[PDB]
C-alpha cells in the first residue's frame, strides 16, 4: 500500500516536472548556454563578414 501511494505521487509529479523547466537556476543555465553558442556563432559570423 505504501509503495502504491509513493508510485501514485511520483506519477503525479509530472506537473511539477513541467513546472521545473521554468525555475531560476535551469533558466539561468539555459541562458548561459545560449550566450556561449551565440558567441561562437557571432565570432564565426565576424570572420565570414
Amino acid at each position: 500500500i505504501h509503495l502504491a501511494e509513493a508510485v501514485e505521487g511520483l506519477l503525479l509529479e509530472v506537473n511539477r516536472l513541467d513546472e521545473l523547466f521554468r525555475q531560476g537556476s535551469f533558466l539561468r543555465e539555459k541562458t548561459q548556454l545560449e550566450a556561449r553558442f551565440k558567441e561562437a556563432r557571432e565570432q564565426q559570423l565576424e570572420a565570414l563578414r
Binding site: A6, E8, L10, E13, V14
Partner: protein, 97 residues
C-alpha cells in the same frame, strides 16, 4: 545541451525525493531506479508516461501467515497455475502492461 540540462535537473531533483523511498523500500531499488530513469527520459525527450504501465501490480496479500496460504487448485491449467497475462484491445491491437 538543453536536453542534457533538463535531464540533469530532473535527476538531481528526483534523487532527493527518492532517498526517502529508498530508505522505506530497500528491496525496490531496481523499480525505483527504473522509474527515475523513465522520468528523466520524459524530461529529456518528452514521451508521456502510462500510469498503468508504471504502477506496481499486487499479486498476493498476506493477512497473518497463520495458517500458511493453502492454495488448492483443482483445475491445474497453465493460466491458473502460473498466472494469466491479460490484454487490452485498441481497435484490434492487443496491448498489455
Amino acid at each position: 545541451a538543453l536536453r542534457r540540462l533538463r535531464r540533469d535537473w530532473a535527476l538531481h531533483y528526483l534523487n532527493n525525493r527518492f532517498e526517502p523511498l529508498f530508505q522505506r523500500f530497500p528491496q525496490a531499488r531496481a523499480y525505483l531506479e527504473a522509474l527515475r530513469a523513465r522520468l528523466a527520459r520524459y524530461a529529456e525527450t518528452g514521451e508521456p508516461l502510462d500510469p498503468a504501465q508504471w504502477r506496481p501490480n499486487l499479486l498476493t496479500s498476506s493477512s497473518s501467515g497463520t495458517p500458511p496460504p493453502i492454495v488448492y487448485e483443482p483445475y491445474a491449467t497453465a493460466p491458473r497455475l502460473f498466472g494469466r497475462l491479460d490484454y487490452l484491445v485498441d481497435r484490434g491491437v492487443w496491448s498489455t502492461n
